[PDB]
mmCIF file of N, CA and C in Angstrom:
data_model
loop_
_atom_site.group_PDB
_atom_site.id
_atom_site.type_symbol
_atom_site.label_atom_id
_atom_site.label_comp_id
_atom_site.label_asym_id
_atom_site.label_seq_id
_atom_site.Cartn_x
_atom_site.Cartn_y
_atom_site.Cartn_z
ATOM 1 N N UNK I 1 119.657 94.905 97.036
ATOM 2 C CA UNK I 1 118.232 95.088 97.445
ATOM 3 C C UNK I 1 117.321 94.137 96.660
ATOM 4 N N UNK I 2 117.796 92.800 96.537
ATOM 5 C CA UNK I 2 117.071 92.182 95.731
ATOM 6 C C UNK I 2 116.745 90.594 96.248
ATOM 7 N N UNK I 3 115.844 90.686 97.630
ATOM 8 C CA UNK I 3 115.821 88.924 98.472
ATOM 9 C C UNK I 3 114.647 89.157 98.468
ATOM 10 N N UNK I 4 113.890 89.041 96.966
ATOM 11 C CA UNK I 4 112.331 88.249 97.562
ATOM 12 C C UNK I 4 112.339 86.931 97.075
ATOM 13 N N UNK I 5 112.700 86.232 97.239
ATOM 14 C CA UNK I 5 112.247 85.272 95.698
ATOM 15 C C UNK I 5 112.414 85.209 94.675
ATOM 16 N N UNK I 6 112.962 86.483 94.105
ATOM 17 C CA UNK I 6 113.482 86.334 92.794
ATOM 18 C C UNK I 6 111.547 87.290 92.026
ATOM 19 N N UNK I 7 111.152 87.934 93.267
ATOM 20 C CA UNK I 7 110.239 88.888 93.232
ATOM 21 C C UNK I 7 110.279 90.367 92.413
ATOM 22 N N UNK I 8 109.544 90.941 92.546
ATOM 23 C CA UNK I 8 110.159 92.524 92.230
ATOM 24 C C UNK I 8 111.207 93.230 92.768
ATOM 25 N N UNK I 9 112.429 93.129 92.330
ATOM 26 C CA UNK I 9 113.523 93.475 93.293
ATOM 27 C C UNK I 9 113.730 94.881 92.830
ATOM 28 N N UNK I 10 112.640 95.371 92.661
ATOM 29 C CA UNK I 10 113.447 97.056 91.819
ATOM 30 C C UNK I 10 114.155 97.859 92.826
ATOM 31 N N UNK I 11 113.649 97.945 94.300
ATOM 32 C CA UNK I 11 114.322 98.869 95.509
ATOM 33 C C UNK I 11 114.253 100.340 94.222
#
């Protein structure tokens, strides 16, 4: 759960 960009991937 972690494909933003390297974004807030907390899910």
């Amino acid at each position: 759960c972690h494909w933003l960009r390297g974004d807030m991937r907390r899910c």
